[PDB]
Design a protein around this ligand. Sequence first.
Ligand SMILES: CCCc1ccccc1N
Ligand SMILES: [Cl-]
Ligand SMILES: [Cl-]
Length: 162
Amino acid sequence: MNIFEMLRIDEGLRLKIYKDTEGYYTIGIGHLLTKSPSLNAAKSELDKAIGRNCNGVITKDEAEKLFNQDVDAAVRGILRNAKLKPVYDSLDAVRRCAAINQVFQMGETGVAGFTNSLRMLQQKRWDEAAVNLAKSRWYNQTPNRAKRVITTFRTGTWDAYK
Ligand SMILES: CCCc1ccccc1N
Ligand SMILES: [Cl-]
Ligand SMILES: [Cl-]
């Protein structure tokens, strides 16, 4: 297992514009297009990201390309963050995938305010961090996914992704 496979599992793959769990226009492998509710803004955003007139539809390769860029951006966002960086570097490889997942789904912002969890993870208090992480709107809105990420942080194995 690796980050791409993991995220492909959590986000799925859709080649036509769709609405995410929060009702926002998205495409491909969880690639957010816009928070606005105007489909047209969304199509404009898609065309600009792809570089051609898509008319709301993309190819598999195009999707995968956005996905590459997006995984990369996420990691790089983590590395640039002062609160995040030190934590991330303290983790092993599996757990780092779980960190990237979260940032991919919620932004560096969202994650940057999980202060108490940050600390617990840095101290390697797995079970404690796991409980703390579940006390969140993130877990409450997307429990199945949050469960898999939390298990991942908790155990350092790919079991939740089976
Ligand atoms: C709870 C925050 C977990 C975390 C630590 C380091 C980098 C990214 C993320 N998501
Ligand atoms: Cl792009
Ligand atoms: Cl879910």
